Design goal:
Two copies of one chain form a homodimer.
Chain A lengths: L6 H4 L7 H12 L10 H9 L2 H24 L1 H9 L3 H28 L12 H16 L7 H34 L3 H29 L4 H29 L3 H5 L6 H17 L5
Helix pairs in contact in A: 2-6, 2-9, 4-6, 4-7, 4-8, 5-6, 6-9, 7-8, 7-10, 8-9, 8-10, 8-12, 9-10, 10-12
The complex binds palmitic acid (PLM) (2 copies) and fe (iii) ion (FE) (4 copies).
One fe (iii) ion binds next to helix 9 of chain A.
Pfam families (chains A, B): Ribonuc_red_sm
Protein name (chains A, B): R2-like ligand binding oxidase
GO molecular function (chains A, B): metal ion binding; oxidoreductase activity
């Protein structure tokens, strides 16, 4: 379907638009290249580990690698729906969002290659709860936007990505990675990558907040919908946390060896503090 | 529609894939930031010009600003269709393609702002030929790919963007800009931007070639279709060149003042040499 004009021909970019200023920040803080990370110490770290120590890390990497790959694939219809609405500055920023996520895919995959598990299918650490979120709910809500770009649809997609997948699971995964492998002194390259990812992530979450708020600002029913969709997914969020927790408890070798007082009941509550504060971040007026 | 697995969980990125290697090159050669370009000399250059000298440059800027904006908006469905086919490395690269184009939009718009024409609607330098290409044929062929991602559809979209809009009009516009304002010593910031754009453009065109060839490599009927779609658009390509040419001839002030032996019958043939060599770039086997 045709264009009925071009904003930068009729006029200019809206230089004061929040998403244009988020875009400017993204060019300035998003120059990191996964190809420049040195994973060699990570290769030795992983080899030194016993088989059962090796398993300790793989479930978390598996959730991240599918997660990054899913968001790289699924964000495209959201960028397209905002394009079609003529929200040019949103689109400019989303280009950085998408390049970020592609770097995220690349980072974890280079790590898997370098530590020697590239040939290994980590699909087995995705339980049904995880599948529900990443294999189903994320692509469903995003792809919807081809045929139905209503505020209700935009709210739902922004919630699924920005406030659950990223704002809850991803952020908790950054925290879990530090609480564990930063302490044991393991996987320096991976944790460098995690740092970069966490910095990128702040812009991603801010885009989701800006999106969700601007729709709630029109009509407050949409605050209710926001919350309803958050809560509708929480059981699958926590069912995946419990699944991963029950895995670390039954594979204590890495914690024992590297003398980690690994507190799963605290990671868990961090997930809850993340989920609840994402709700807080959306003002109802 | 769901995911049936993730490549970087089952396996890894295909590190030897051409589009992964194009992606690596894009991160390394695509760090330029339009916000760092100094347009101040351009502001003085544009002010010094007489009204009729001012008009000389605006038609070319108008075609570029709509063009960049159009490709930023319209490439999204191609990235989505390749995502859905599971061509992960294509998608990784397309993220750089899209960020590039967003920088392209930004560059020309910052220039318009800085030289003082942001408030001016340059839609009047788009004739019906130009509209046919950029307002209609480009979004049509790209958007098709939501519902019809057949090789015939992918060939057509890659041809419209990579071998006409970019491979013919954009490249000739880089050449026209040097032949004119590089000679007169005008608009240093703009021409810096044009240089960067031209470097980016080489990856864009290579993606279109790789796309078109990989489909022709299956079945040779698609070489015929490639050519048929090129030629089907040429009348609108040249009708826009003639339109812009007939404008420079009737506004000789800028050429007279800055003593430019501006040869439109040579720019024109450059357009023809660009169009014909894009055809050459697609081997039929
Ligand atoms: C045992 C405590 C569990 C801690 C929670 C760990 C969750 C793993 C994270 C995987 C999901 C990654 C989603 C990426 C989102 C993005 O790229 O924006
Ligand atoms: C008088 C001689 C005419 C010379 C031809 C000039 C054509 C102007 C270019 C405008 C189209 C720009 C398309 C951008 C494509 C891209 O960003 O890949
Ligand atoms: Fe990410
Ligand atoms: Fe993210
Ligand atoms: Fe461009
Ligand atoms: Fe281009």
């Amino acid at each position: 379907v045709h264009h009925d004009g071009f904003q930068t021909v009729k006029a200019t970019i809206d230089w004061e638009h929040p998403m244009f200023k988020l875009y400017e920040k993204a060019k300035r803080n998003g120059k990191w290249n996964p190809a420049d990370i040195d994973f060699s110490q990570d290769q030795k770290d992983f080899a030194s580990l016993t088989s059962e120590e090796k398993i300790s890390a793989l479930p978390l990497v598996a959730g991240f690698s599918a997660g990054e790959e899913a968001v790289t694939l699924d964000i495209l219809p959201m960028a397209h729906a905002l394009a079609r609405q003529g929200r040019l500055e949103d689109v400019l920023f989303l280009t950085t969002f998408m390049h970020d996520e592609a770097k995220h895919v690349e980072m974890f995959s280079r790590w898997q290659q370098a530590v020697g598990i590239g040939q290994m299918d980590l699909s087995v650490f995705h339980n049904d709860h995880y599948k529900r979120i990443f294999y189903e709910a994320l692509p469903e809500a995003m792809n919807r936007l081809y045929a139905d770009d209503s505020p209700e649809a935009v709210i739902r997609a922004a919630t699924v990505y920005n406030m659950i997948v990223a704002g809850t699971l991803a952020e908790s995964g950054y925290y879990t990675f530090r609480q564990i492998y930063k302490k044991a002194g393991l996987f320096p390259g991976l944790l460098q990558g995690i740092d970069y990812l966490n910095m990128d992530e702040g812009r991603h979450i801010q885009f989701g907040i800006y999106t969700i708020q601007r729709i709630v600002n029109e009509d407050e029913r949409y605050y209710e919908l926001f919350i309803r969709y958050m809560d509708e997914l929480w059981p699958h969020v926590i069912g995946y946390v419990d699944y991963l927790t029950e895995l670390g408890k039954r594979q204590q070798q890495l914690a024992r060896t590297y003398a980690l007082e690994i507190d799963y009941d605290l990671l868990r509550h961090y997930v809850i503090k993340q989920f609840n504060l994402r709700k807080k971040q959306i003002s109802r007026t």
